[PDB]
Design an enzyme around this catalytic site. Structure first.
Site, PDB file in Angstrom:
ATOM      1  N   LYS A 209      14.444   1.690   3.351  1.00 11.49           N
ATOM      2  CA  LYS A 209      13.270   0.878   3.081  1.00 11.49           C
ATOM      3  C   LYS A 209      12.235   1.221   4.134  1.00 11.49           C
ATOM      4  O   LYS A 209      12.536   1.187   5.330  1.00 11.49           O
ATOM      5  CB  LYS A 209      13.585  -0.627   3.113  1.00 11.49           C
ATOM      6  CG  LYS A 209      12.346  -1.501   2.844  1.00 11.49           C
ATOM      7  CD  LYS A 209      11.943  -1.489   1.360  1.00 11.49           C
ATOM      8  CE  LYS A 209      10.603  -2.128   1.123  1.00 11.49           C
ATOM      9  NZ  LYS A 209       9.472  -1.142   1.226  1.00 11.49           N
ATOM     10  N   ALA A 212       4.670  -0.300   6.323  1.00 11.23           N
ATOM     11  CA  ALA A 212       3.417   0.068   6.987  1.00 11.23           C
ATOM     12  C   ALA A 212       2.609  -1.192   7.198  1.00 11.23           C
ATOM     13  O   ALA A 212       2.689  -2.112   6.389  1.00 11.23           O
ATOM     14  CB  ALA A 212       2.639   1.041   6.100  1.00 11.23           C
TER      15      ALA A 212
HETATM   16  C1  LIG Z   1       5.249  -2.864   3.456  1.00 11.13           C
HETATM   17  O1  LIG Z   1       5.391  -2.343   4.522  1.00 11.13           O
HETATM   18  C2  LIG Z   1       3.989  -2.765   2.678  1.00 11.13           C
HETATM   19  C3  LIG Z   1       3.931  -3.523   1.502  1.00 11.13           C
HETATM   20  N1  LIG Z   1       3.156  -3.425   0.416  1.00 11.13           N
HETATM   21  C4  LIG Z   1       2.128  -2.573   0.199  1.00 11.13           C
HETATM   22  C5  LIG Z   1       0.721  -3.165   0.140  1.00 11.13           C
HETATM   23  O2  LIG Z   1       0.566  -4.339   0.563  1.00 11.13           O
HETATM   24  O3  LIG Z   1      -0.208  -2.455  -0.273  1.00 11.13           O
HETATM   25  C6  LIG Z   1       2.415  -1.226  -0.060  1.00 11.13           C
HETATM   26  C7  LIG Z   1       1.445  -0.311  -0.474  1.00 11.13           C
HETATM   27  O4  LIG Z   1       1.923   0.970  -0.884  1.00 11.13           O
HETATM   28  C8  LIG Z   1       0.893   1.808  -1.171  1.00 11.13           C
HETATM   29  C9  LIG Z   1       0.285   2.679  -0.066  1.00 11.13           C
HETATM   30  O5  LIG Z   1       0.472   1.869  -2.326  1.00 11.13           O
HETATM   31  C10 LIG Z   1       3.799  -0.637   0.239  1.00 11.13           C
HETATM   32  S1  LIG Z   1       3.824  -0.094   1.977  1.00 11.13           S
HETATM   33  O6  LIG Z   1       5.254   0.194   2.349  1.00 11.13           O
HETATM   34  O7  LIG Z   1       2.979   1.122   2.100  1.00 11.13           O
HETATM   35  C11 LIG Z   1       3.218  -1.619   2.898  1.00 11.13           C
HETATM   36  C12 LIG Z   1       1.843  -1.816   3.133  1.00 11.13           C
HETATM   37  O8  LIG Z   1       1.373  -2.953   3.248  1.00 11.13           O
HETATM   38  O9  LIG Z   1       1.082  -0.711   3.244  1.00 11.13           O
HETATM   39  C13 LIG Z   1      -0.323  -0.709   3.659  1.00 11.13           C
HETATM   40  C14 LIG Z   1      -1.224  -1.547   2.742  1.00 11.13           C
HETATM   41  C15 LIG Z   1      -0.461  -1.179   5.110  1.00 11.13           C
HETATM   42  C16 LIG Z   1      -0.737   0.751   3.564  1.00 11.13           C
END
Ligand SMILES: *C(=O)[C@@H]1/C=N\C(C(=O)O)=C(\COC(C)=O)CS(=O)(=O)[C@H]1C(=O)OC(C)(C)C
Ligand SMILES: OC[C@H]1O[C@H](O[C@H]2[C@H](O)[C@@H](O)[C@H](OCCCCCCC3CCCCC3)O[C@@H]2CO)[C@H](O)[C@@H](O)[C@@H]1O
Length: 265
Positions: A209, A212
């Site tokens: 898992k 970010a």
């Molecule tokens: C978990 O770490 C995050 C959860 N969700 C998320 C989002 O809020 O946008 C993701 C977005 O994935 C993409 C880049 O489409 C999954 S993630 O693992 O990248 C993450 C997150 O928040 O990512 C950012 C918005 C900070 C890039």
């Protein structure tokens, strides 16, 4: 590649940020590599694995069913709900919500599940119940990703997260079926799993898992090993770096390469 510790150090130098890392034998808990292992890092979406451990514990106790359908409303949804926004009319089962949270990083799925375990305080209580006295969840998606400098909210340490994952996957706190389910969700990650496989040599197992957050926060909790076995837990977190996402990904991959090239330790 350098020795794993030297590569980790190189990654800090290049990122200007803090890296935290544990490499641990899954079966025994032997710690092989530790760097800033007792320092705090934002969990970001990596918390979703522990979350579904708490859900599974409730299933085992007869307080929950993975089959149970949860119906929810559009006003409940938060940012990034790729699976859950498709099921406003028909709902999702608890098990489907855990699959969406772990394998798609669906934020609303995670919040729906967090509700069932008593919210952030309930999840923190579950962590204490399994003997993790360090990891804490304080907020919901998406505020838990803020990664404010010096803020202890929504953090773990590499050592605590590795020990906690090992407890969930192997310690018989969870039932055999539940341990198998949690593992399978990580095997099925769609966000990073296929990408990681595309760069791993043939024969290397991955389950994971990733996460970010703000201020460069990035991380992965993973199972990795040769001979198609989940031999080791590897936990890597990054914080307080201005680097691009691509550069953070490449530094984590570099640490992985060092482990692979120097596996027998
Ligand atoms: C978990 O770490 C995050 C959860 N969700 C998320 C989002 O809020 O946008 C993701 C977005 O994935 C993409 C880049 O489409 C999954 S993630 O693992 O990248 C993450 C997150 O928040 O990512 C950012 C918005 C900070 C890039
Ligand atoms: O001799 C060992 C291997 O060395 C190379 O493999 C390279 C591979 O070609 C490269 O793509 C990868 O990058 C690293 C990719 C790691 C992906 C992320 C790992 C995660 C998993 C655990 C959590 C932290 C990081 O490095 C290995 C080791 O040099 C050769 O290509 C391969 O034929 C050989 O079997």
């Amino acid at each position: 590649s350098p020795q794993p510790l030297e590569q980790i150090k190189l990654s800090e130098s290049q990122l200007s940020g803090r890296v935290g890392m544990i490499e641990m034998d899954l079966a025994s808990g032997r710690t092989l590599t530790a760097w800033r292992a007792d320092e705090r890092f934002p969990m970001m979406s990596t918390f979703k694995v522990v979350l579904c451990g708490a859900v599974l514990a409730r299933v085992d106790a007869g307080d929950e069913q993975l089959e149970r359908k949860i119906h929810y409303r559009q006003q409940d949804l938060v940012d990034y709900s790729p699976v859950s926004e498709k099921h406003l009319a028909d709902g999702m089962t608890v098990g489907e919500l855990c699959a969406a949270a772990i394998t798609m990083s669906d934020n609303s799925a995670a919040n729906l599940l967090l509700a069932t375990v008593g919210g952030p305080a309930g999840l923190t209580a579950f962590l204490r119940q399994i003997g993790d006295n360090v990891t804490r969840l304080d907020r919901w998606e998406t505020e838990l990703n803020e990664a404010l400098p010096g803020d202890a909210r929504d953090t773990t340490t590499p050592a605590s997260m590795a020990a906690t994952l090992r407890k969930l996957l192997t310690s018989q706190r969870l039932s055999a079926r539940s341990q198998r389910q949690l593992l399978q969700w990580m095997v099925d990650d769609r966000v990073a799993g296929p990408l990681i496989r595309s760069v791993l040599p043939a024969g290397w197992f991955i389950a994971d898992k990733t996460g970010a957050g703000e201020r460069g926060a990035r991380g992965i909790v993973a199972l990795l090993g040769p001979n198609n076995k989940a031999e080791r837990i590897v936990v890597i977190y990054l914080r307080d770096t201005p680097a691009s996402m691509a550069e953070r990904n490449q530094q984590i991959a570099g640490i992985g390469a060092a482990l692979i090239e120097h596996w027998q330790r």
